Amino acid sequence: SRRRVVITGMGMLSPLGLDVPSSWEGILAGRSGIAPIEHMDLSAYSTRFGGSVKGFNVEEYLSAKEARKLDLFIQYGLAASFQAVRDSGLEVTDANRERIGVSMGSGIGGLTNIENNCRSLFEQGPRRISPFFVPGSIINMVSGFLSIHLGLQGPNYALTTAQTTGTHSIGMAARNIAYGEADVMVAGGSEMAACGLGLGGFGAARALSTRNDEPTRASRPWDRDRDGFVLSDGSGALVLEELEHARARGARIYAELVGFGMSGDAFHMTAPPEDGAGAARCMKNALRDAGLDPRQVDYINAHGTSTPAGDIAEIAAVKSVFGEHAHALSMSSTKSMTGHLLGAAGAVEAIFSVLALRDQVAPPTINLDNPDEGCDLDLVAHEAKPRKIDVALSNSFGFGGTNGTLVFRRFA
Amino acid sequence: SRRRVVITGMGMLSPLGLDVPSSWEGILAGRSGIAPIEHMDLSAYSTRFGGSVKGFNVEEYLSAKEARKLDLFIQYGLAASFQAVRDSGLEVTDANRERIGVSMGSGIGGLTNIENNCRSLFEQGPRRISPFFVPGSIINMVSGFLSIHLGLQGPNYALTTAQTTGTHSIGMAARNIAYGEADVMVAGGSEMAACGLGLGGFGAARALSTRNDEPTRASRPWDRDRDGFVLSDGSGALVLEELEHARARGARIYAELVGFGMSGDAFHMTAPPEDGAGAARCMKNALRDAGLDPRQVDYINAHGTSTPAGDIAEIAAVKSVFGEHAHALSMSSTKSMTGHLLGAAGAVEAIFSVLALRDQVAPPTINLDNPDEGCDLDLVAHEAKPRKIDVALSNSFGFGGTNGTLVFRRFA
Ligand SMILES: C[C@H]1CCO[C@@H]1C(=O)Nc1cnns1
């Protein structure tokens, strides 16, 4: 048998806010976090906008000295992680520290740090590379530094599954608890790839919206005028906890994590198949994992990146999985507002899925002015929709055809 | 309920050979794969040698047209995975493709590729970044590309836990099979961090041996004259298989994976604790997971990186875990010959640990001329030691204080 896993703590940096409640306020108001990128000459780039974290103050979390050693993606990961642990009320002791672990991931990791040390290397040679280059850039250092700061001796690892990282991180952390490898996990992801290499690299593949005249309208999932995703920065962290452990200490429980699904498309390196067969197997895997019938699903936080082939694939996959219930559930893309946080996308979207359960509201898909051919589901166009939500899904479909689905249910 | 997991296939690129048997012959004969690096000018660097993969032909596996788009770490990952799958005898069909997944990891991933595209961005501009920069560089694309070429639709993911990556990838893939998430997994890791940023960054931290005048003698685990690790490239892949699934198809079984441990040190970003307390916790978890008396352990493939603090920490951990039996078992570091493959270290060493079981021989620790203070165990100095091996343990320890132990035993 399996132990039940609940959410007792959440943390976030997003383009909408420096914590969960500010971010969630933005989401329910349909506000965009997308804007031209500042303090960076993007003259030579086809995309000049994205979702930046605005007014982040790392000294709320770290000494200036410890922050100087760590890539922005690590700083953002630690910020969400510290918020989430604080939010949980959890007290680490010698009696429980071996039962508390971390799985914070990233899709792309330390590009900004890699960029600046490349500058040093090419200009002045290798003796100007920072001593903290490696440990300050590698993806497992959010898990590493958090475990050191809080004395966490439980399973300590990091996933990197591109745009699926946060969803897989939360899911596999839930498995650790369910099968008794840990009582508590801090799970999620962080990302900061709005450097030249990120904007340039995605730009070279012509994957990015180039709607530079109206950045806030760039991200328009399922709209006929969409022209690729918007690159965004930030982090999500959840405190995952065994139910009896949560009840014994009187924790506030936001919701229950009931289901986790994984699948591989085995199709293309960057493009999903048109019928979304892989996303369909992954959602079916997640519902079977949760012992739920597709009919019980009320809300889906779509991957919904605003790529032509991705958006249409997800519709095909929802209609395939849900049949005559596909129109009854509400499905929205909060990427319409946040843009695509890549490896942190699944983390902040799991948090939005949990908050949809708490507040009984489907977040909007903003900019959905002209649904495309066969995009005829309840996509929650323009404005938030209060409704009954007992069961919420969060999907992530990333490069390499790697898919994740989380299933959350109301707890009472 | 928890299923048993066996090894039915292995594959490798190492500094000692372009497959497993050629690499293993090198291990048993005490041959070094460490040499001055030829693929770049290192005159400005304080370390000018490492374990290069010699004479690698990507056209044994992939079209030149596809290989051109991929970092060497992905090429090396695919080579090893392809070897392991062929070696397994497994045939992928519509009946089983949903039950076969892949977990191939990396510590750093496509650093060469990111550096070269960084040079294009800085010298010319963003218009010269390869359209293949992202899918050709990010860590999850070994798993991605492998699933696309073989049609693997099972769990598809990648770990990045620095020098522990290979051990964690193999352990967590076993858990997937153990718990019914898959019946087959291709798991391990790949690394190619020998670019300017890699040799420069580890150099900046003064973590590397600078024995440039005698590179084959640089890697000297537990030797009093050791001065840091030797940086090495390559890949290890194993096919992990549910036992009854293996029995049902008449698979050749190399050995059984009976134990997996993880722990965090929660000590330091980069230094291990002198007492090996996190390594001891990790091995004890692994031995309890295997249902073993620690006196059943015959052979340990140590992390044994040839750092002053790392090597002594391991002795202390082994003495704390095994007490008087610490004097009866054999422990060696194959990093004495291969150098440190970082994220691939745990993958190649898991394979050496299985071959130690097949051939009943402890590989040597070469260059152990003057064992250091307290390094008084059977460290198999100089020469391979034929001996009874029923149970073999493989340890990895990484930046972030992240620990992994694998336990293998002979299968009857
Ligand atoms: C000893 C190894 C390497 C050369 O031949 C063997 C092999 O498996 N080759 C493969 C090619 N494609 N898939 S496997």
Side-chain angles (χ1 to χ4, degrees), chain A residues 44-45 115 118-119 122 127 129 139-140 147 153 156-160 172 175 181 197 204 264 266 268 281 399 402, chain B residues 44 46 98 118-119 121-122 126 129 139-140 147-148 153 156 158-160 172 175 179 181 204 264 266 281 399 402:
Chain A
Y45 291 73
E115 232 161 70
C118 274
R119 211 180 314 285
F122 300 153
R127 300 316 175 82
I129 295 161
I139 286 163
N140 75 299
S147 82
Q153 290 185 345
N156 195 302
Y157 67 99
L159 296 205
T160 186
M172 287 195 77
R175 298 272 196 258
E181 283 154 7
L197 288 169
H268 189 262
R281 286 194 301 283
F399 289 180
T402 184
Chain B
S46 48
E98 287 180 30
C118 210
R119 192 180 281 280
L121 172 62
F122 283 166
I129 292 158
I139 288 170
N140 79 306
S147 70
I148 293 166
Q153 293 189 341
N156 191 300
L159 309 196
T160 188
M172 283 200 38
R175 291 284 202 258
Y179 297 152
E181 289 143 14
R281 278 200 302 281
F399 294 176
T402 192

Short mmCIF file of all heavy atoms in Angstrom, two decimals, chain A residues 44-45 115 118-119 122 127 129 139-140 147 153 156-160 172 175 181 197 204 264 266 268 281 399 402, chain B residues 44 46 98 118-119 121-122 126 129 139-140 147-148 153 156 158-160 172 175 179 181 204 264 266 281 399 402:
data_model
loop_
_atom_site.label_atom_id
_atom_site.label_comp_id
_atom_site.label_asym_id
_atom_site.label_seq_id
_atom_site.Cartn_x
_atom_site.Cartn_y
_atom_site.Cartn_z
N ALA A 44 19.78 43.41 -31.24
CA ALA A 44 20.15 42.42 -32.27
C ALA A 44 19.24 41.18 -32.22
O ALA A 44 19.45 40.28 -33.06
CB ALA A 44 21.60 42.03 -32.10
N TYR A 45 18.29 41.13 -31.29
CA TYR A 45 17.41 39.96 -30.99
C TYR A 45 16.04 40.17 -31.63
O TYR A 45 15.58 41.31 -31.65
CB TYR A 45 17.25 39.80 -29.47
CG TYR A 45 18.50 39.37 -28.74
CD1 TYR A 45 19.56 40.24 -28.55
CD2 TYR A 45 18.61 38.10 -28.23
CE1 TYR A 45 20.71 39.85 -27.89
CE2 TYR A 45 19.75 37.68 -27.57
CZ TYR A 45 20.80 38.56 -27.38
OH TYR A 45 21.91 38.13 -26.73
N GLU A 115 27.42 32.73 -19.02
CA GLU A 115 27.63 33.93 -19.87
C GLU A 115 28.73 34.81 -19.29
O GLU A 115 29.65 35.17 -20.03
CB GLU A 115 26.36 34.79 -19.93
CG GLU A 115 25.91 35.13 -21.34
CD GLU A 115 24.46 35.56 -21.38
OE1 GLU A 115 24.15 36.67 -20.88
OE2 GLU A 115 23.63 34.77 -21.87
N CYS A 118 32.15 33.15 -19.28
CA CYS A 118 32.58 33.14 -20.70
C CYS A 118 33.23 34.48 -21.07
O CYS A 118 34.31 34.45 -21.69
CB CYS A 118 31.42 32.85 -21.64
SG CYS A 118 31.19 31.08 -21.82
N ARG A 119 32.55 35.58 -20.75
CA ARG A 119 33.09 36.95 -20.92
C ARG A 119 34.52 36.97 -20.35
O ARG A 119 35.43 37.23 -21.13
CB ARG A 119 32.18 37.99 -20.26
CG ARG A 119 32.21 39.34 -20.97
CD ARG A 119 31.31 40.38 -20.34
NE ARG A 119 29.96 39.89 -20.03
CZ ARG A 119 29.00 39.67 -20.93
NH1 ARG A 119 29.24 39.87 -22.22
NH2 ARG A 119 27.82 39.24 -20.53
N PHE A 122 37.13 34.52 -22.36
CA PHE A 122 37.43 34.94 -23.76
C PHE A 122 38.28 36.20 -23.76
O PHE A 122 39.11 36.34 -24.67
CB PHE A 122 36.15 35.21 -24.55
CG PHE A 122 35.23 34.03 -24.66
CD1 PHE A 122 33.87 34.23 -24.82
CD2 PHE A 122 35.72 32.73 -24.63
CE1 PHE A 122 33.01 33.14 -24.93
CE2 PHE A 122 34.86 31.65 -24.75
CZ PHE A 122 33.51 31.86 -24.89
N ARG A 127 42.13 32.28 -15.73
CA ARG A 127 42.49 32.62 -14.33
C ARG A 127 41.50 33.66 -13.79
O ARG A 127 41.49 33.87 -12.57
CB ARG A 127 43.96 33.06 -14.25
CG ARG A 127 44.97 32.01 -14.69
CD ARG A 127 44.75 30.57 -14.20
NE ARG A 127 45.69 29.61 -14.76
CZ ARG A 127 46.93 29.39 -14.32
NH1 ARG A 127 47.40 30.06 -13.28
NH2 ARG A 127 47.71 28.50 -14.92
N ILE A 129 38.17 33.11 -14.15
CA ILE A 129 36.93 32.34 -13.86
C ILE A 129 36.76 32.26 -12.33
O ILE A 129 37.73 31.97 -11.62
CB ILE A 129 36.91 30.95 -14.54
CG1 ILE A 129 36.87 31.07 -16.06
CG2 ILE A 129 35.75 30.10 -14.04
CD1 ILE A 129 37.31 29.82 -16.77
N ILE A 139 22.70 22.53 -11.26
CA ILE A 139 21.23 22.58 -11.01
C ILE A 139 20.92 22.05 -9.61
O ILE A 139 19.92 22.53 -9.03
CB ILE A 139 20.50 21.86 -12.17
CG1 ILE A 139 20.53 22.78 -13.40
CG2 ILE A 139 19.08 21.51 -11.79
CD1 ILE A 139 20.23 22.11 -14.72
N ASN A 140 21.74 21.16 -9.05
CA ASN A 140 21.43 20.47 -7.77
C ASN A 140 21.78 21.36 -6.57
O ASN A 140 21.58 20.90 -5.43
CB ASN A 140 22.12 19.11 -7.69
CG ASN A 140 23.60 19.21 -7.41
OD1 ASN A 140 24.36 19.79 -8.18
ND2 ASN A 140 24.01 18.67 -6.28
N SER A 147 19.28 22.21 1.85
CA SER A 147 19.60 21.11 2.79
C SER A 147 20.65 21.59 3.81
O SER A 147 20.50 21.25 5.00
CB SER A 147 20.07 19.87 2.07
OG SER A 147 21.44 19.96 1.75
N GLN A 153 18.42 16.18 5.98
CA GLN A 153 19.30 15.00 5.76
C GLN A 153 18.54 13.93 4.96
O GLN A 153 19.10 12.82 4.75
CB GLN A 153 19.85 14.48 7.09
CG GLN A 153 20.86 15.42 7.73
CD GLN A 153 21.47 14.83 8.98
OE1 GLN A 153 20.98 13.86 9.55
NE2 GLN A 153 22.50 15.47 9.49
N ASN A 156 18.09 13.96 -1.24
CA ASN A 156 18.56 15.26 -1.79
C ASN A 156 18.95 15.07 -3.26
O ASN A 156 20.01 14.46 -3.53
CB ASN A 156 19.73 15.83 -0.97
CG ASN A 156 20.00 17.28 -1.27
OD1 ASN A 156 20.27 17.65 -2.41
ND2 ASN A 156 19.93 18.12 -0.25
N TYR A 157 18.14 15.59 -4.17
CA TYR A 157 18.36 15.39 -5.63
C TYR A 157 17.73 16.55 -6.40
O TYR A 157 17.09 17.42 -5.83
CB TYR A 157 17.91 13.97 -6.02
CG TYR A 157 16.43 13.66 -5.92
CD1 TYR A 157 15.62 13.70 -7.04
CD2 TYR A 157 15.85 13.25 -4.73
CE1 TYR A 157 14.26 13.41 -6.97
CE2 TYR A 157 14.50 12.94 -4.64
CZ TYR A 157 13.70 13.02 -5.77
OH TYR A 157 12.37 12.73 -5.71
N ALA A 158 17.97 16.55 -7.71
CA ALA A 158 17.40 17.57 -8.62
C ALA A 158 17.07 16.90 -9.96
O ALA A 158 17.85 16.00 -10.40
CB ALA A 158 18.36 18.73 -8.74
N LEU A 159 15.89 17.19 -10.49
CA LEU A 159 15.46 16.76 -11.85
C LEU A 159 15.80 17.88 -12.84
O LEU A 159 15.89 19.06 -12.45
CB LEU A 159 13.96 16.49 -11.84
CG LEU A 159 13.49 15.33 -10.97
CD1 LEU A 159 12.18 14.81 -11.52
CD2 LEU A 159 14.51 14.19 -10.90
N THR A 160 15.98 17.52 -14.10
CA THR A 160 16.11 18.47 -15.23
C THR A 160 15.40 17.79 -16.40
O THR A 160 15.98 16.88 -17.00
CB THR A 160 17.57 18.90 -15.37
OG1 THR A 160 17.68 19.92 -16.36
CG2 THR A 160 18.49 17.74 -15.71
N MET A 172 7.73 13.10 -8.23
CA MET A 172 8.71 12.11 -7.72
C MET A 172 8.96 12.35 -6.22
O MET A 172 9.19 11.37 -5.51
CB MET A 172 10.02 12.15 -8.50
CG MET A 172 9.88 11.54 -9.90
SD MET A 172 11.47 11.18 -10.70
CE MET A 172 11.93 9.67 -9.83
N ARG A 175 6.17 10.57 -4.56
CA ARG A 175 6.51 9.12 -4.52
C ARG A 175 7.42 8.84 -3.32
O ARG A 175 7.18 7.86 -2.60
CB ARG A 175 7.16 8.64 -5.82
CG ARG A 175 6.25 8.79 -7.03
CD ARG A 175 5.37 7.58 -7.25
NE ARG A 175 4.78 7.52 -8.58
CZ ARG A 175 3.52 7.85 -8.89
NH1 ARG A 175 2.69 8.36 -7.99
NH2 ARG A 175 3.11 7.69 -10.14
N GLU A 181 10.08 6.71 1.94
CA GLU A 181 11.51 7.11 1.80
C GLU A 181 11.74 8.44 2.52
O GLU A 181 12.89 8.77 2.77
CB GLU A 181 11.91 7.25 0.32
CG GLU A 181 12.14 5.93 -0.41
CD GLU A 181 11.92 5.99 -1.92
OE1 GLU A 181 11.71 7.12 -2.44
OE2 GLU A 181 11.92 4.92 -2.58
N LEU A 197 21.73 34.05 -24.09
CA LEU A 197 21.78 32.64 -24.51
C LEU A 197 20.35 32.07 -24.57
O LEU A 197 20.05 31.36 -25.54
CB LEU A 197 22.68 31.86 -23.55
CG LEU A 197 24.17 32.17 -23.70
CD1 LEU A 197 24.95 31.56 -22.54
CD2 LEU A 197 24.70 31.67 -25.03
N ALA A 204 16.82 31.50 -32.04
CA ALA A 204 17.45 30.80 -33.18
C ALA A 204 16.53 29.70 -33.71
O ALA A 204 16.56 29.44 -34.91
CB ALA A 204 18.78 30.25 -32.77
N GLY A 264 6.49 9.27 -22.21
CA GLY A 264 7.31 9.78 -23.31
C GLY A 264 6.52 9.68 -24.60
O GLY A 264 5.94 8.63 -24.81
N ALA A 266 8.06 9.80 -27.51
CA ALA A 266 8.95 9.09 -28.47
C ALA A 266 8.65 9.55 -29.91
O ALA A 266 8.59 8.67 -30.80
CB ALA A 266 8.78 7.60 -28.32
N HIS A 268 9.26 13.60 -31.39
CA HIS A 268 10.17 14.66 -31.91
C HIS A 268 10.90 15.35 -30.75
O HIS A 268 10.47 15.19 -29.57
CB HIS A 268 9.38 15.64 -32.79
CG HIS A 268 10.22 16.63 -33.53
ND1 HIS A 268 10.42 17.93 -33.08
CD2 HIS A 268 10.91 16.53 -34.70
CE1 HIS A 268 11.20 18.57 -33.92
NE2 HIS A 268 11.52 17.74 -34.92
N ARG A 281 -1.79 9.57 -22.78
CA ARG A 281 -1.28 8.43 -21.96
C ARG A 281 -0.86 8.93 -20.58
O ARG A 281 -1.12 8.25 -19.57
CB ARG A 281 -0.07 7.78 -22.64
CG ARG A 281 -0.42 6.92 -23.85
CD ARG A 281 0.73 6.02 -24.29
NE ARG A 281 1.96 6.71 -24.66
CZ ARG A 281 2.16 7.35 -25.81
NH1 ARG A 281 1.19 7.43 -26.71
NH2 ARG A 281 3.32 7.92 -26.07
N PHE A 399 10.45 19.43 -24.18
CA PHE A 399 11.42 18.96 -25.19
C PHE A 399 11.81 17.51 -24.85
O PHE A 399 11.89 17.15 -23.68
CB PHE A 399 12.62 19.90 -25.30
CG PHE A 399 12.32 21.24 -25.94
CD1 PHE A 399 13.32 22.19 -26.09
CD2 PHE A 399 11.05 21.56 -26.40
CE1 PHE A 399 13.06 23.42 -26.70
CE2 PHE A 399 10.78 22.80 -26.98
CZ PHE A 399 11.79 23.73 -27.13
N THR A 402 8.84 14.59 -23.22
CA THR A 402 8.73 14.17 -21.80
C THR A 402 7.51 14.86 -21.18
O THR A 402 7.40 16.10 -21.26
CB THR A 402 10.06 14.37 -21.04
OG1 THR A 402 9.90 13.84 -19.72
CG2 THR A 402 10.53 15.80 -20.98
N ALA B 44 47.48 28.08 -20.91
CA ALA B 44 47.13 29.09 -19.88
C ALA B 44 46.48 28.44 -18.64
O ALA B 44 46.29 29.15 -17.63
CB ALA B 44 46.23 30.13 -20.49
N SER B 46 46.09 25.63 -15.39
CA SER B 46 46.95 24.97 -14.37
C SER B 46 46.81 23.44 -14.44
O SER B 46 47.66 22.75 -13.81
CB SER B 46 46.66 25.49 -12.99
OG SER B 46 45.27 25.51 -12.72
N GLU B 98 5.28 1.08 -23.72
CA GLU B 98 4.75 1.99 -22.67
C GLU B 98 5.40 1.66 -21.33
O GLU B 98 5.35 2.52 -20.44
CB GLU B 98 3.22 1.95 -22.61
CG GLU B 98 2.57 2.64 -23.80
CD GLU B 98 1.06 2.64 -23.80
OE1 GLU B 98 0.47 2.64 -22.72
OE2 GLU B 98 0.47 2.67 -24.90
N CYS B 118 28.22 30.67 -26.83
CA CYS B 118 28.57 31.90 -26.08
C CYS B 118 29.60 32.72 -26.87
O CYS B 118 29.44 33.94 -26.94
CB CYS B 118 29.08 31.61 -24.67
SG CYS B 118 28.68 32.98 -23.57
N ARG B 119 30.61 32.06 -27.45
CA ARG B 119 31.67 32.69 -28.27
C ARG B 119 31.02 33.32 -29.52
O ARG B 119 31.33 34.49 -29.81
CB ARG B 119 32.73 31.63 -28.59
CG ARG B 119 34.01 32.19 -29.18
CD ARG B 119 34.99 31.07 -29.46
NE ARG B 119 35.66 30.63 -28.25
CZ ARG B 119 36.70 31.25 -27.67
NH1 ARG B 119 37.21 32.36 -28.19
NH2 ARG B 119 37.23 30.75 -26.57
N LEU B 121 27.84 34.35 -29.80
CA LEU B 121 27.01 35.47 -29.29
C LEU B 121 27.88 36.70 -29.03
O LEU B 121 27.43 37.79 -29.37
CB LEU B 121 26.29 35.04 -28.02
CG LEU B 121 25.54 36.14 -27.27
CD1 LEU B 121 24.43 36.76 -28.11
CD2 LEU B 121 24.97 35.58 -25.97
N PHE B 122 29.07 36.53 -28.45
CA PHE B 122 29.92 37.65 -27.96
C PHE B 122 30.74 38.27 -29.10
O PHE B 122 30.99 39.49 -29.07
CB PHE B 122 30.85 37.18 -26.83
CG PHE B 122 30.19 37.02 -25.48
CD1 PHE B 122 30.85 36.33 -24.47
CD2 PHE B 122 28.94 37.55 -25.21
CE1 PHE B 122 30.26 36.17 -23.23
CE2 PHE B 122 28.35 37.39 -23.97
CZ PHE B 122 29.02 36.70 -22.97
N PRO B 126 23.68 37.38 -31.66
CA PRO B 126 22.68 36.35 -31.43
C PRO B 126 22.25 35.65 -32.71
O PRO B 126 21.83 34.52 -32.63
CB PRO B 126 21.48 37.09 -30.81
CG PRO B 126 21.69 38.53 -31.23
CD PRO B 126 23.19 38.72 -31.27
N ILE B 129 23.71 32.14 -33.23
CA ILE B 129 23.45 31.00 -32.28
C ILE B 129 22.78 29.87 -33.08
O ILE B 129 21.82 30.15 -33.81
CB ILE B 129 22.67 31.44 -31.03
CG1 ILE B 129 23.52 32.36 -30.14
CG2 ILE B 129 22.19 30.23 -30.25
CD1 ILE B 129 22.71 33.24 -29.21
N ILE B 139 20.24 18.77 -20.45
CA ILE B 139 20.64 17.47 -19.85
C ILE B 139 19.59 16.40 -20.18
O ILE B 139 20.01 15.24 -20.33
CB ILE B 139 20.89 17.68 -18.35
CG1 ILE B 139 22.19 18.45 -18.13
CG2 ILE B 139 20.88 16.39 -17.56
CD1 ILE B 139 22.40 18.90 -16.73
N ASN B 140 18.29 16.74 -20.30
CA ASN B 140 17.22 15.72 -20.44
C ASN B 140 17.17 15.10 -21.84
O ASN B 140 16.33 14.21 -22.06
CB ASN B 140 15.84 16.26 -20.09
CG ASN B 140 15.23 17.08 -21.20
OD1 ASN B 140 15.86 18.02 -21.68
ND2 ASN B 140 14.01 16.76 -21.58
N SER B 147 14.59 7.82 -26.37
CA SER B 147 13.16 7.44 -26.48
C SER B 147 12.69 7.58 -27.93
O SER B 147 11.97 6.69 -28.39
CB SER B 147 12.30 8.24 -25.53
OG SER B 147 12.20 9.60 -25.91
N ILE B 148 13.10 8.65 -28.63
CA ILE B 148 12.70 8.93 -30.05
C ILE B 148 13.27 7.84 -30.98
O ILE B 148 12.47 7.24 -31.72
CB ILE B 148 13.12 10.36 -30.43
CG1 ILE B 148 12.31 11.41 -29.65
CG2 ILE B 148 13.01 10.61 -31.93
CD1 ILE B 148 12.88 12.81 -29.71
N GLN B 153 8.28 4.69 -24.49
CA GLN B 153 7.15 5.58 -24.12
C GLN B 153 6.95 5.56 -22.60
O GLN B 153 5.99 6.19 -22.11
CB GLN B 153 5.92 5.17 -24.93
CG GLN B 153 6.09 5.42 -26.42
CD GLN B 153 4.79 5.20 -27.17
OE1 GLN B 153 3.89 4.56 -26.68
NE2 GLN B 153 4.68 5.76 -28.35
N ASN B 156 10.23 9.09 -18.59
CA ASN B 156 11.30 9.74 -19.38
C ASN B 156 11.80 10.93 -18.57
O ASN B 156 11.10 11.93 -18.50
CB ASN B 156 10.79 10.18 -20.73
CG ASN B 156 11.92 10.61 -21.64
OD1 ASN B 156 12.67 11.54 -21.34
ND2 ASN B 156 12.03 9.92 -22.76
N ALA B 158 15.57 12.85 -16.34
CA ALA B 158 17.02 12.99 -16.15
C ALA B 158 17.26 13.60 -14.77
O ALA B 158 16.52 14.51 -14.38
CB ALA B 158 17.57 13.84 -17.28
N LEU B 159 18.24 13.06 -14.05
CA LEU B 159 18.75 13.63 -12.78
C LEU B 159 19.99 14.46 -13.08
O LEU B 159 20.73 14.17 -14.06
CB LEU B 159 19.12 12.53 -11.80
CG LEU B 159 18.07 11.46 -11.54
CD1 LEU B 159 18.44 10.72 -10.28
CD2 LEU B 159 16.67 12.03 -11.41
N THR B 160 20.19 15.49 -12.28
CA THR B 160 21.46 16.24 -12.24
C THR B 160 21.79 16.46 -10.78
O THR B 160 21.14 17.33 -10.16
CB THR B 160 21.37 17.49 -13.11
OG1 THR B 160 22.71 17.97 -13.10
CG2 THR B 160 20.33 18.50 -12.65
N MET B 172 17.05 5.34 -8.67
CA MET B 172 15.66 5.85 -8.85
C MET B 172 14.97 5.11 -10.00
O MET B 172 13.77 4.85 -9.89
CB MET B 172 15.64 7.36 -9.09
CG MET B 172 15.87 8.16 -7.81
SD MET B 172 15.30 9.88 -7.89
CE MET B 172 13.79 9.70 -8.83
N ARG B 175 13.84 1.90 -8.45
CA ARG B 175 12.60 2.20 -7.70
C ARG B 175 11.40 2.25 -8.65
O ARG B 175 10.34 1.73 -8.28
CB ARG B 175 12.75 3.50 -6.91
CG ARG B 175 13.74 3.42 -5.76
CD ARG B 175 13.17 2.67 -4.58
NE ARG B 175 13.87 3.03 -3.36
CZ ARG B 175 14.80 2.31 -2.75
NH1 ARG B 175 15.19 1.13 -3.22
NH2 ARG B 175 15.35 2.79 -1.66
N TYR B 179 8.40 -0.42 -7.99
CA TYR B 179 7.06 0.09 -7.59
C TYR B 179 6.02 -0.07 -8.70
O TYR B 179 4.90 0.38 -8.48
CB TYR B 179 7.13 1.56 -7.17
CG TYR B 179 7.99 1.85 -5.97
CD1 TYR B 179 8.61 3.09 -5.82
CD2 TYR B 179 8.15 0.93 -4.95
CE1 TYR B 179 9.38 3.38 -4.71
CE2 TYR B 179 8.92 1.20 -3.83
CZ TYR B 179 9.54 2.43 -3.71
OH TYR B 179 10.31 2.70 -2.62
N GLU B 181 6.00 1.29 -11.87
CA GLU B 181 5.87 2.44 -12.81
C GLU B 181 6.40 2.06 -14.20
O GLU B 181 6.05 2.77 -15.17
CB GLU B 181 6.58 3.69 -12.28
CG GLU B 181 5.89 4.33 -11.09
CD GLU B 181 6.82 4.92 -10.03
OE1 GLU B 181 8.03 5.07 -10.33
OE2 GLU B 181 6.36 5.18 -8.89
N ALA B 204 39.84 27.04 -11.15
CA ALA B 204 39.61 28.24 -10.31
C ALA B 204 39.39 27.80 -8.86
O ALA B 204 39.88 28.49 -7.98
CB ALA B 204 38.43 29.03 -10.82
N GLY B 264 21.52 13.41 2.41
CA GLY B 264 22.25 14.69 2.38
C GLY B 264 23.19 14.81 3.57
O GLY B 264 22.80 14.40 4.68
N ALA B 266 24.13 17.86 4.55
CA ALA B 266 23.70 19.14 5.13
C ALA B 266 24.91 19.80 5.80
O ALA B 266 24.72 20.39 6.85
CB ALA B 266 22.58 18.91 6.11
N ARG B 281 25.49 7.32 6.79
CA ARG B 281 24.00 7.29 6.79
C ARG B 281 23.51 6.67 5.48
O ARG B 281 22.61 5.83 5.51
CB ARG B 281 23.43 8.71 6.95
CG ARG B 281 23.36 9.22 8.39
CD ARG B 281 22.37 10.37 8.55
NE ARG B 281 22.68 11.51 7.69
CZ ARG B 281 23.62 12.41 7.94
NH1 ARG B 281 24.36 12.32 9.03
NH2 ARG B 281 23.83 13.40 7.09
N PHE B 399 28.84 17.57 -4.71
CA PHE B 399 28.52 18.97 -4.32
C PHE B 399 27.05 19.02 -3.89
O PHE B 399 26.20 18.31 -4.47
CB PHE B 399 28.84 19.95 -5.46
CG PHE B 399 30.30 20.09 -5.81
CD1 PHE B 399 30.69 20.89 -6.89
CD2 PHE B 399 31.30 19.44 -5.09
CE1 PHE B 399 32.03 21.02 -7.23
CE2 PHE B 399 32.64 19.59 -5.42
CZ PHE B 399 33.00 20.37 -6.49
N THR B 402 25.27 15.61 -1.43
CA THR B 402 24.32 14.58 -1.93
C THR B 402 25.04 13.24 -2.11
O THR B 402 26.01 13.20 -2.87
CB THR B 402 23.65 15.04 -3.22
OG1 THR B 402 22.57 14.13 -3.43
CG2 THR B 402 24.61 15.06 -4.39
#
